[PDB]
Design a protein around this ligand. Structure first.
Ligand SMILES: Nc1ncnc2c1ncn2[C@@H]1O[C@H](COP(=O)(O)OP(=O)(O)O)[C@@H](O)[C@H]1O
Ligand SMILES: O=C(CCOc1ccc(F)cc1)N1CCSCC1
Ligand SMILES: [Mg+2]
Ligand SMILES: [Mg+2]
Length: 265
Protein backbone atom coordinates (compact mmCIF):
# COMPACT_ATOMS: atom_id res chain seq x y z
CA UNK A 1 0.00 0.00 0.00
CA UNK A 2 2.17 2.90 1.29
CA UNK A 3 5.67 3.63 -0.03
CA UNK A 4 8.40 6.28 0.36
CA UNK A 5 6.99 8.18 -2.63
CA UNK A 6 3.90 9.06 -0.58
CA UNK A 7 5.79 11.18 2.01
CA UNK A 8 7.80 14.40 2.23
CA UNK A 9 10.56 14.00 4.82
CA UNK A 10 11.54 16.70 7.32
CA UNK A 11 13.74 17.06 10.35
CA UNK A 12 15.24 14.25 12.46
CA UNK A 13 13.22 13.65 15.62
CA UNK A 14 15.63 11.21 17.25
CA UNK A 15 17.95 8.22 17.05
CA UNK A 16 17.76 4.70 18.45
CA UNK A 17 19.92 1.57 18.20
CA UNK A 18 18.30 0.61 14.88
CA UNK A 19 15.72 3.36 14.44
CA UNK A 20 16.26 6.81 13.01
CA UNK A 21 12.97 8.70 13.37
CA UNK A 22 11.94 11.58 11.06
CA UNK A 23 9.16 14.12 10.90
CA UNK A 24 7.11 13.58 7.69
CA UNK A 25 3.94 14.67 5.84
CA UNK A 26 1.74 12.44 3.66
CA UNK A 27 1.45 14.12 0.25
CA UNK A 28 -2.27 13.94 -0.59
CA UNK A 29 -3.79 14.31 2.89
CA UNK A 30 -1.13 16.67 4.33
CA UNK A 31 -1.21 14.43 7.46
CA UNK A 32 1.76 15.01 9.81
CA UNK A 33 3.37 11.98 11.38
CA UNK A 34 6.61 10.32 12.45
CA UNK A 35 8.51 7.83 10.30
CA UNK A 36 10.73 5.26 12.11
CA UNK A 37 13.38 3.89 9.70
CA UNK A 38 15.21 0.61 10.29
CA UNK A 39 18.04 -0.89 8.25
CA UNK A 40 17.35 -4.50 7.17
CA UNK A 41 21.08 -5.30 7.23
CA UNK A 42 21.43 -4.28 10.88
CA UNK A 43 18.16 -5.97 11.88
CA UNK A 44 19.47 -9.20 10.38
CA UNK A 45 22.98 -8.95 11.84
CA UNK A 46 21.49 -8.56 15.30
CA UNK A 47 18.81 -11.16 14.50
CA UNK A 48 15.93 -9.16 15.94
CA UNK A 49 13.34 -9.74 13.18
CA UNK A 50 10.97 -11.28 15.79
CA UNK A 51 11.13 -8.14 17.99
CA UNK A 52 10.12 -5.93 15.07
CA UNK A 53 7.18 -8.23 14.26
CA UNK A 54 6.09 -8.07 17.92
CA UNK A 55 6.39 -4.26 17.90
CA UNK A 56 4.07 -3.90 14.87
CA UNK A 57 1.55 -6.55 16.02
CA UNK A 58 1.15 -5.53 19.67
CA UNK A 59 1.21 -1.73 19.15
CA UNK A 60 -1.11 -1.42 16.10
CA UNK A 61 -3.88 -3.23 17.96
CA UNK A 62 -3.73 -1.26 21.24
CA UNK A 63 -5.96 1.84 21.63
CA UNK A 64 -5.45 4.10 24.67
CA UNK A 65 -4.92 7.91 25.00
CA UNK A 66 -1.68 7.31 26.95
CA UNK A 67 -0.20 4.89 24.37
CA UNK A 68 1.43 6.00 21.06
CA UNK A 69 -0.45 4.84 17.91
CA UNK A 70 1.14 2.80 15.14
CA UNK A 71 -0.77 3.16 11.86
CA UNK A 72 1.15 0.93 9.47
CA UNK A 73 4.41 -0.13 7.83
CA UNK A 74 6.15 -0.69 4.46
CA UNK A 75 9.62 -1.72 3.21
CA UNK A 76 11.92 -1.26 0.21
CA UNK A 77 14.72 -3.88 0.12
CA UNK A 78 17.13 -1.97 2.32
CA UNK A 79 14.81 -0.45 4.94
CA UNK A 80 11.70 -1.01 7.01
CA UNK A 81 9.43 1.98 7.76
CA UNK A 82 7.02 2.23 10.72
CA UNK A 83 4.33 4.92 10.48
CA UNK A 84 3.75 6.44 13.93
CA UNK A 85 1.63 9.05 15.66
CA UNK A 86 3.77 12.25 15.96
CA UNK A 87 4.38 13.44 19.56
CA UNK A 88 5.00 17.20 19.32
CA UNK A 89 6.42 17.91 22.81
CA UNK A 90 9.32 15.45 22.75
CA UNK A 91 10.62 12.94 25.28
CA UNK A 92 10.32 12.88 29.06
CA UNK A 93 14.09 12.32 28.93
CA UNK A 94 14.61 15.76 27.35
CA UNK A 95 12.28 17.43 29.86
CA UNK A 96 14.20 15.87 32.76
CA UNK A 97 17.53 17.07 31.38
CA UNK A 98 16.05 20.57 31.01
CA UNK A 99 14.66 20.85 34.58
CA UNK A 100 17.02 18.45 36.48
CA UNK A 101 14.21 17.25 38.80
CA UNK A 102 10.40 17.22 38.66
CA UNK A 103 8.22 18.57 41.52
CA UNK A 104 5.76 16.32 43.34
CA UNK A 105 2.74 17.38 41.25
CA UNK A 106 4.49 16.75 37.92
CA UNK A 107 5.85 13.39 39.15
CA UNK A 108 2.53 12.11 40.52
CA UNK A 109 0.66 13.14 37.35
CA UNK A 110 3.18 11.31 35.13
CA UNK A 111 2.88 8.20 37.38
CA UNK A 112 -0.98 8.18 37.10
CA UNK A 113 -0.85 8.40 33.29
CA UNK A 114 1.74 5.57 33.17
CA UNK A 115 -0.23 3.40 35.58
CA UNK A 116 -3.38 3.89 33.46
CA UNK A 117 -1.63 2.93 30.24
CA UNK A 118 0.04 -0.10 31.91
CA UNK A 119 -3.25 -1.23 33.46
CA UNK A 120 -4.72 -1.31 29.95
CA UNK A 121 -1.71 -3.28 28.61
CA UNK A 122 -1.74 -5.83 31.45
CA UNK A 123 -5.48 -6.47 30.89
CA UNK A 124 -4.39 -8.09 27.61
CA UNK A 125 -1.49 -9.81 29.40
CA UNK A 126 0.90 -7.58 27.44
CA UNK A 127 4.09 -6.52 29.27
CA UNK A 128 6.30 -3.69 27.95
CA UNK A 129 9.65 -4.47 29.64
CA UNK A 130 11.53 -1.29 28.41
CA UNK A 131 9.85 1.55 30.30
CA UNK A 132 12.38 4.41 30.59
CA UNK A 133 12.40 8.19 29.97
CA UNK A 134 13.61 8.05 26.29
CA UNK A 135 10.59 5.83 25.47
CA UNK A 136 7.99 8.13 27.06
CA UNK A 137 6.70 10.85 24.70
CA UNK A 138 4.58 13.98 25.20
CA UNK A 139 1.42 14.92 23.34
CA UNK A 140 0.13 18.37 22.42
CA UNK A 141 -1.50 18.88 25.83
CA UNK A 142 1.61 17.67 27.64
CA UNK A 143 0.15 14.22 28.35
CA UNK A 144 2.48 11.23 28.67
CA UNK A 145 2.41 8.49 25.99
CA UNK A 146 4.21 5.12 26.19
CA UNK A 147 6.19 4.26 23.04
CA UNK A 148 8.80 1.75 21.69
CA UNK A 149 7.17 -1.68 21.99
CA UNK A 150 10.19 -3.49 20.55
CA UNK A 151 10.83 -5.50 23.73
CA UNK A 152 7.18 -6.25 24.60
CA UNK A 153 5.71 -9.79 24.93
CA UNK A 154 2.89 -11.94 26.38
CA UNK A 155 3.27 -13.42 29.90
CA UNK A 156 4.77 -15.60 31.31
CA UNK A 157 8.22 -15.45 29.66
CA UNK A 158 11.97 -15.83 29.70
CA UNK A 159 14.47 -13.67 27.83
CA UNK A 160 15.64 -15.03 24.47
CA UNK A 161 17.59 -11.91 23.45
CA UNK A 162 20.81 -10.28 24.71
CA UNK A 163 20.49 -7.16 26.90
CA UNK A 164 22.29 -4.47 24.90
CA UNK A 165 22.51 -1.23 26.87
CA UNK A 166 21.53 -0.05 30.34
CA UNK A 167 20.61 -2.31 33.26
CA UNK A 168 19.15 0.66 35.14
CA UNK A 169 15.40 -0.06 34.80
CA UNK A 170 15.35 -3.87 34.94
CA UNK A 171 14.27 -5.94 38.00
CA UNK A 172 16.45 -8.69 39.58
CA UNK A 173 14.58 -11.63 37.98
CA UNK A 174 15.14 -10.14 34.56
CA UNK A 175 18.86 -9.44 34.83
CA UNK A 176 19.47 -12.82 36.46
CA UNK A 177 17.84 -14.36 33.38
CA UNK A 178 15.01 -15.99 35.33
CA UNK A 179 11.38 -16.34 34.31
CA UNK A 180 9.38 -13.11 34.71
CA UNK A 181 5.82 -11.73 34.38
CA UNK A 182 3.78 -8.45 34.58
CA UNK A 183 5.48 -7.43 37.83
CA UNK A 184 8.57 -6.33 35.85
CA UNK A 185 6.72 -3.15 34.76
CA UNK A 186 5.86 -2.33 38.39
CA UNK A 187 9.54 -2.44 39.36
CA UNK A 188 10.37 -0.04 36.47
CA UNK A 189 7.53 2.25 37.61
CA UNK A 190 9.29 2.48 41.00
CA UNK A 191 12.65 3.18 39.34
CA UNK A 192 11.01 5.96 37.32
CA UNK A 193 9.26 7.57 40.31
CA UNK A 194 12.63 7.85 42.05
CA UNK A 195 14.40 9.25 38.97
CA UNK A 196 11.65 11.86 38.44
CA UNK A 197 11.99 13.18 42.04
CA UNK A 198 15.79 12.81 42.47
CA UNK A 199 17.28 13.43 39.00
CA UNK A 200 18.98 10.04 38.65
CA UNK A 201 17.88 6.36 38.89
CA UNK A 202 18.35 4.61 42.26
CA UNK A 203 20.86 1.91 41.28
CA UNK A 204 23.11 4.01 39.06
CA UNK A 205 26.82 3.14 39.14
CA UNK A 206 29.97 3.50 37.05
CA UNK A 207 30.19 -0.03 35.68
CA UNK A 208 27.82 -2.74 34.45
CA UNK A 209 29.20 -5.11 37.05
CA UNK A 210 28.43 -2.91 40.07
CA UNK A 211 25.03 -1.79 38.76
CA UNK A 212 24.23 -5.48 38.54
CA UNK A 213 25.26 -5.92 42.21
CA UNK A 214 23.20 -2.96 43.44
CA UNK A 215 20.07 -4.16 41.58
CA UNK A 216 20.18 -7.80 42.75
CA UNK A 217 20.66 -6.63 46.38
CA UNK A 218 18.18 -3.69 46.09
CA UNK A 219 20.69 -1.21 47.53
CA UNK A 220 19.22 2.30 47.33
CA UNK A 221 18.96 5.30 49.65
CA UNK A 222 16.86 8.51 49.67
CA UNK A 223 18.08 12.13 49.75
CA UNK A 224 16.65 14.23 52.61
CA UNK A 225 14.22 16.17 50.39
CA UNK A 226 12.19 13.08 49.40
CA UNK A 227 8.97 13.18 51.47
CA UNK A 228 7.52 10.32 53.52
CA UNK A 229 4.69 9.61 51.10
CA UNK A 230 7.02 9.28 48.12
CA UNK A 231 9.37 6.97 50.07
CA UNK A 232 6.41 4.76 50.99
CA UNK A 233 5.28 4.32 47.40
CA UNK A 234 8.82 3.80 46.05
CA UNK A 235 9.74 1.29 48.80
CA UNK A 236 6.64 -0.79 47.96
CA UNK A 237 7.45 -0.96 44.22
CA UNK A 238 11.14 -1.81 44.61
CA UNK A 239 10.70 -5.25 46.24
CA UNK A 240 13.09 -8.09 45.38
CA UNK A 241 10.18 -10.54 45.39
CA UNK A 242 7.84 -9.80 42.44
CA UNK A 243 4.74 -11.07 44.25
CA UNK A 244 5.17 -8.50 47.02
CA UNK A 245 4.95 -5.60 44.53
CA UNK A 246 1.52 -3.88 44.55
CA UNK A 247 -1.26 -4.09 41.93
CA UNK A 248 -1.66 -1.06 39.67
CA UNK A 249 -4.95 -0.13 41.43
CA UNK A 250 -2.99 0.22 44.66
CA UNK A 251 -0.59 2.64 42.92
CA UNK A 252 -3.45 4.72 41.47
CA UNK A 253 -5.12 4.72 44.92
CA UNK A 254 -2.04 5.51 47.02
CA UNK A 255 -2.56 8.65 49.23
CA UNK A 256 0.55 10.46 47.95
CA UNK A 257 -0.63 9.94 44.34
CA UNK A 258 -4.21 11.12 45.05
CA UNK A 259 -2.94 14.17 46.93
CA UNK A 260 -0.51 15.32 44.23
CA UNK A 261 -1.76 14.07 40.84
CA UNK A 262 -3.86 16.39 38.68
CA UNK A 263 -5.50 13.66 36.58
CA UNK A 264 -7.87 10.78 37.51
CA UNK A 265 -7.87 6.97 37.05
N1 LIG B 1 6.36 9.36 17.48
C1 LIG B 1 7.44 10.12 17.81
N2 LIG B 1 7.35 11.48 17.91
C2 LIG B 1 8.43 12.22 18.26
N3 LIG B 1 9.65 11.71 18.54
C3 LIG B 1 9.87 10.37 18.48
C4 LIG B 1 8.74 9.50 18.09
N4 LIG B 1 9.20 8.23 18.12
C5 LIG B 1 10.51 8.28 18.44
N5 LIG B 1 10.91 9.56 18.67
C6 LIG B 1 12.29 9.96 19.04
O1 LIG B 1 13.21 9.01 18.48
C7 LIG B 1 13.81 8.19 19.50
C8 LIG B 1 13.90 6.71 19.15
O2 LIG B 1 12.62 6.11 18.89
P1 LIG B 1 12.35 4.58 19.35
O3 LIG B 1 11.04 4.20 18.72
O4 LIG B 1 12.38 4.59 20.85
O5 LIG B 1 13.62 3.85 18.73
P2 LIG B 1 14.47 2.56 19.28
O6 LIG B 1 13.54 1.38 19.11
O7 LIG B 1 15.65 2.43 18.37
O8 LIG B 1 14.82 2.91 20.71
C9 LIG B 1 12.97 8.42 20.74
O9 LIG B 1 13.74 8.22 21.92
C10 LIG B 1 12.48 9.85 20.55
O10 LIG B 1 13.51 10.79 20.88
O1 LIG C 1 11.56 -8.15 4.89
C1 LIG C 1 10.89 -8.24 5.92
C2 LIG C 1 9.46 -8.67 5.88
C3 LIG C 1 8.51 -7.56 5.42
O2 LIG C 1 8.58 -6.51 6.40
C4 LIG C 1 7.84 -6.65 7.62
C5 LIG C 1 8.04 -5.71 8.60
C6 LIG C 1 7.37 -5.82 9.81
C7 LIG C 1 6.52 -6.87 9.98
F1 LIG C 1 5.86 -6.98 11.15
C8 LIG C 1 6.31 -7.82 9.03
C9 LIG C 1 6.98 -7.71 7.82
N1 LIG C 1 11.40 -7.88 7.12
C10 LIG C 1 12.71 -7.25 7.28
C11 LIG C 1 13.57 -7.95 8.31
S1 LIG C 1 12.82 -7.94 9.94
C12 LIG C 1 11.30 -8.75 9.44
C13 LIG C 1 10.59 -7.98 8.34
MG1 LIG D 1 13.52 3.50 22.33
MG1 LIG E 1 13.27 -0.67 19.73
Amino acid sequence: QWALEDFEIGRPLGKGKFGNVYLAREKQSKFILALKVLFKAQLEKAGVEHQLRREVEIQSHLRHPNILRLYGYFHDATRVYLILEYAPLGTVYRELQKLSKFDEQRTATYITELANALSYCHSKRVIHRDIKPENLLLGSAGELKIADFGWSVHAPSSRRTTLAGTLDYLPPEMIEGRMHDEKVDLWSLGVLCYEFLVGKPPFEANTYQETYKRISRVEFTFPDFVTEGARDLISRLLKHNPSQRPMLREVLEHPWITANSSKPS
